[PDB]
């Protein structure tokens, strides 16, 4: 999902449905290869010791001036018009150049 | 003439710095509801003697 050949935009993004697999976050949290690392809601240590229901992977490419709006409780040209996260967002945002 | 494009295009150049660099954003969404928790990793790493 990070080294994908093709992708979509920030408003017509393809939701990569992830199901029936073990989500190992050890190769993504402490890999020292992702520049933007935002987390909201809860700590990322609880994302590996507590089970959740639905996990979706929204893969899109956006610039750094509009990557700050992908957060609960923001505004702008993306957080109100293109892609908005819910207020009860207990996930993380991982991106790389 | 009278053909405006509100869907403006992005700009990605190698000469730009970290401000306009392409970020492969993958949003890790999580949600808890009345449905049983299924996809967060059903098993973990343990040990045995």
């Amino acid at each position: 999902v990070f080294n994908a050949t093709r992708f979509a935009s920030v408003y017509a993004w393809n939701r990569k449905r992830i199901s029936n697999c073990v989500a190992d976050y050890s190769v993504l949290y402490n890999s020292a290869s992702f520049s933007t690392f935002k987390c909201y809601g809860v700590s990322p240590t609880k994302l590996n010791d507590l089970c959740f229901t639905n996990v979706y992977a929204d893969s899109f490419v956006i610039r750094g001036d509009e990557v700050r709006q992908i957060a609960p409780g923001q505004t702008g040209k993306i957080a109100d018009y293109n892609y908005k996260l819910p207020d009860d967002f207990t996930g993380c945002v991982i991106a790389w150049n | 003439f009278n053909c405006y494009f509100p869907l403006q295009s992005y700009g990605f150049q190698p000469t730009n710095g970290v401000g306009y660099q392409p970020y492969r954003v993958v949003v890790l969404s999580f949600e808890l509801l009345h449905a049983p928790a299924t996809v967060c990793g059903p098993k973990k790493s343990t040990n045995l003697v």
Partner: antibody
Amino acid sequence: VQLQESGPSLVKPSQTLSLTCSVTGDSITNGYWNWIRKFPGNKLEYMGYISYSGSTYYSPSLKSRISITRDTSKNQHYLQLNSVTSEDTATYYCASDYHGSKYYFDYWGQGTTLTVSS
Amino acid sequence: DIVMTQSHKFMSTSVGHRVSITCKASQDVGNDVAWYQQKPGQSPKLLIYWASTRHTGVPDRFTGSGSGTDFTLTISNVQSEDLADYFCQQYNRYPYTFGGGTKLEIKR
């Protein structure tokens, strides 16, 4: 490459802010040159940045009263803030936000202390 | 904002003593923790990127470690000319939130 800060240090409230930062040793062709102000007491706050193409973006602390311009002919860039008050009394610094060889480098300048009061 | 709250504001380190500056983050920022170096009479420059890799032109006596939330700077065999201010900040997204800072002193 050494950065040098300049500009006026006496700006009355409800006026137009104007600063000038000069870059010696590298033209405005690659990277970013941002604005970071310094409050008395080791308190730093981000203001904005601009590339060499002309497009800029503002900090979420201010809503719409900050505009950042650049100049590739004189290798300088300006900062403009409208409707200033006593909260803008800080020492503005200029940096160099550029990357290279899968790493990030940054260096600041001398800074110019600006006082907005009566 | 993710404020990089430091644990100590000052530390007495002699020539050759190991510097240990610990900054506690309220939110996990991964590994995008950088350090500054504000010398008296010089310009503040970035020293350590990704909490382990030094800046170009700087000798290998400045290094460190850290993972997730507990980031601790480790300067082995420091000298008297390295008396500067070390700040804790982030570079993952805009705006860049800065902390208080730690000023070193030569133990005499």
